[PDB]
Design a protein around this ligand. Sequence first.
Ligand SMILES: *[C@@H]1O[C@H](CO)[C@@H](O[C@@H]2O[C@H](CO)[C@@H](O[C@@H]3O[C@H](CO[C@H]4O[C@H](CO)[C@@H](O)[C@H](O)[C@@H]4O)[C@@H](O)[C@H](O[C@H]4O[C@H](CO)[C@@H](O)[C@H](O)[C@@H]4O)[C@@H]3O)[C@H](O)[C@H]2NC(C)=O)[C@H](O)[C@H]1NC(C)=O
Ligand SMILES: *[C@@H]1O[C@H](CO)[C@@H](O[C@@H]2O[C@H](CO)[C@@H](O[C@@H]3O[C@H](CO)[C@@H](O)[C@H](O)[C@@H]3O)[C@H](O)[C@H]2NC(C)=O)[C@H](O)[C@H]1NC(C)=O
Ligand SMILES: *[C@@H]1O[C@H](CO)[C@@H](O[C@@H]2O[C@H](CO)[C@@H](O[C@@H]3O[C@H](CO)[C@@H](O)[C@H](O)[C@@H]3O)[C@H](O)[C@H]2NC(C)=O)[C@H](O)[C@H]1NC(C)=O
Ligand SMILES: *[C@@H]1O[C@H](CO)[C@@H](O[C@@H]2O[C@H](CO)[C@@H](O)[C@H](O)[C@H]2NC(C)=O)[C@H](O)[C@H]1NC(C)=O
Ligand SMILES: *[C@@H]1O[C@H](CO)[C@@H](O)[C@H](O)[C@H]1NC(C)=O
Ligand SMILES: *[C@@H]1O[C@H](CO)[C@@H](O)[C@H](O)[C@H]1NC(C)=O
Length: 454
Amino acid sequence: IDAQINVDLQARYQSVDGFGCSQAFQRAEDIFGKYGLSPKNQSYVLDLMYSEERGAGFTILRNGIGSSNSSTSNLMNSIEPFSPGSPSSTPNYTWDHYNSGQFPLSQQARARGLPYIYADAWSAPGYMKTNQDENWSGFLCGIEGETCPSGDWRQAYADYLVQYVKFYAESGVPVTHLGFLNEPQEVVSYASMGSNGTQAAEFVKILGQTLEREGIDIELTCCDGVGWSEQEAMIPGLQVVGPDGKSAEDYLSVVTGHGYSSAPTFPLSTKRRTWLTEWTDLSGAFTPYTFFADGGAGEGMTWANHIQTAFVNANVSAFIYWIGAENSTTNSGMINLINDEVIPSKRFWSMASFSKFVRPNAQRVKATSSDASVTVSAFENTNGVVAIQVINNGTSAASLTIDLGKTHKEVKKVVPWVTSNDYDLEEMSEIDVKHNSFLASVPARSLTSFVTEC
Ligand SMILES: *[C@@H]1O[C@H](CO)[C@@H](O[C@@H]2O[C@H](CO)[C@@H](O[C@@H]3O[C@H](CO[C@H]4O[C@H](CO)[C@@H](O)[C@H](O)[C@@H]4O)[C@@H](O)[C@H](O[C@H]4O[C@H](CO)[C@@H](O)[C@H](O)[C@@H]4O)[C@@H]3O)[C@H](O)[C@H]2NC(C)=O)[C@H](O)[C@H]1NC(C)=O
Ligand SMILES: *[C@@H]1O[C@H](CO)[C@@H](O[C@@H]2O[C@H](CO)[C@@H](O[C@@H]3O[C@H](CO)[C@@H](O)[C@H](O)[C@@H]3O)[C@H](O)[C@H]2NC(C)=O)[C@H](O)[C@H]1NC(C)=O
Ligand SMILES: *[C@@H]1O[C@H](CO)[C@@H](O[C@@H]2O[C@H](CO)[C@@H](O[C@@H]3O[C@H](CO)[C@@H](O)[C@H](O)[C@@H]3O)[C@H](O)[C@H]2NC(C)=O)[C@H](O)[C@H]1NC(C)=O
Ligand SMILES: *[C@@H]1O[C@H](CO)[C@@H](O[C@@H]2O[C@H](CO)[C@@H](O)[C@H](O)[C@H]2NC(C)=O)[C@H](O)[C@H]1NC(C)=O
Ligand SMILES: *[C@@H]1O[C@H](CO)[C@@H](O)[C@H](O)[C@H]1NC(C)=O
Ligand SMILES: *[C@@H]1O[C@H](CO)[C@@H](O)[C@H](O)[C@H]1NC(C)=O
């Protein structure tokens, strides 16, 4: 079919912080050879994830603030594993320069140019909660409606999160973003802690005011809701103005949600930047080579479309997959490790196509398609490089006319990068741009990134 694409760089929307993943629950250790990954492939995996030149150039790493009093199973151990006795008692903090592999990972990401580290707690330690357990949800003692005999642990949890941040900064790795909940809706056998919008809002202000007293500059986030509409449901709570004249929203830099219980397909009703902070296929299926087959949950194109929809329809500034690389034959990670073997999925190459060319502080700009089989997004980088992502979900190749409209300079060359059943992230021959317009074919069932050269 013939499709006209029109890009208007004068119609500008949200800014981009970028793309990344987590290595939480000891999956950092997989990248560092726990299951036999060779030194060559450890370096290769870190290059795929964090090198702009050789891989995806991911700009966000989401690390877990461990709540556990051991490192058995897949547990993330805490800097304050055992009760100090009472909320006012002196904490016994312990720093291992490790954080379940996440500390060295952070160093090696940063060494390759990673700007943003997002530290997120799944739970306060057990002894700070109503149920005296890091597991099975429960509430931080002292938040509205949730008293405990042992007293009020709110300030203690804020001081604990700040201590985690200081250990990182004093070891040469500043944390840029901090969250204190993960999926507060979920009652599960692993690290988890509940709260509604009002309870979340109450702690945002305590944590915010605590970081101001300590003179620590960091971006606060909430609430990593299990789904987008679950996060939406908490935002009015975060927007309630208390007698102090402030909302939790006044302290937040970023509102965060997951895609599991509902996908980012509409804009959250906050004035802050929004991030999709966790999403993957948890079916247990294994589809590393499939860009398109039947629209399965683990397919390359499914994730190409999740990403494009999140930016174009859900107005996000970042997209963070769940696990980057893990020793498994499931779709829960983007890169499958099989002992000393690296298999990057089409889900990874889809993320890489966006991340490689849509760099931090890029602005999303208007892009329209004359045919629904061909979906488009466009971003302008701060250096002026325009990156246009085109998903052709046609059963046949699409002949595109792409019109960049009025630009700052003039555009003379554009380079296509293709992802499909046949290609990972394949650089094609440059295309001549005449009067800020060019012709291009895109294959059936493909993602193409068109990147302007100078
Ligand atoms: C190191 O950290 C671990 C993990 O956080 C701690 O182990 C937990 O300790 C807590 C506190 O005693 C235990 O909490 C209790 O959990 C019960 C659930 O019991 C069963 O269910 C699960 C899953 O099927 C099993 O893992 C478990 O073994 C049990 O068979 C709750 O029913 C209890 O609730 C009662 O007490 C609370 C708190 O006072 C009340 O609010 C309740 O209403 C109710 O009366 C209780 O919450 C927890 O089970 C332990 N987990 C594990 C995995 O062992 C260690 O305590 C900690 N060690 C140190 C030294 O700090
Ligand atoms: C999509 O997300 C972006 C954030 O990435 C949202 O931008 C935010 O828009 C609001 C409302 O326009 C801005 O607040 C306003 O600020 C101006 C200038 O200070 C002021 O005149 C208004 O009274 C109001 O407070 C906010 O600054 C802006 N946020 C950022 C980070 O730029 C955008 O609104 C979202 N779009 C949709 C449709 O939800
Ligand atoms: C580092 O990782 C690479 C990439 O996984 C490893 O190389 C790959 O090793 C596997 C063997 O486990 C090879 O798989 C074989 O591929 C052929 C097809 O070409 C297939 O017919 C066989 O059944 C088998 O699956 C793979 O080809 C191979 N080399 C590549 C992709 O270049 C490597 O062994 C790891 N270690 C080191 C030290 O590099
Ligand atoms: C691309 O088009 C195909 C149909 O040609 C869509 O595939 C369907 O996807 C759903 C789940 O989204 C499956 O339940 C159906 O079985 C699929 N139909 C097939 C394979 O015939 C696919 O969703 C489209 N992808 C887009 C628009 O991103
Ligand atoms: C790593 O994953 C593969 C594939 O699932 C599995 O068979 C293997 O046993 C795992 N390695 C170790 C050392 O457990
Ligand atoms: C949140 O929880 C508290 C304590 O149960 C309750 O008082 C409050 O009304 C709840 N907030 C909302 C918005 O339901």
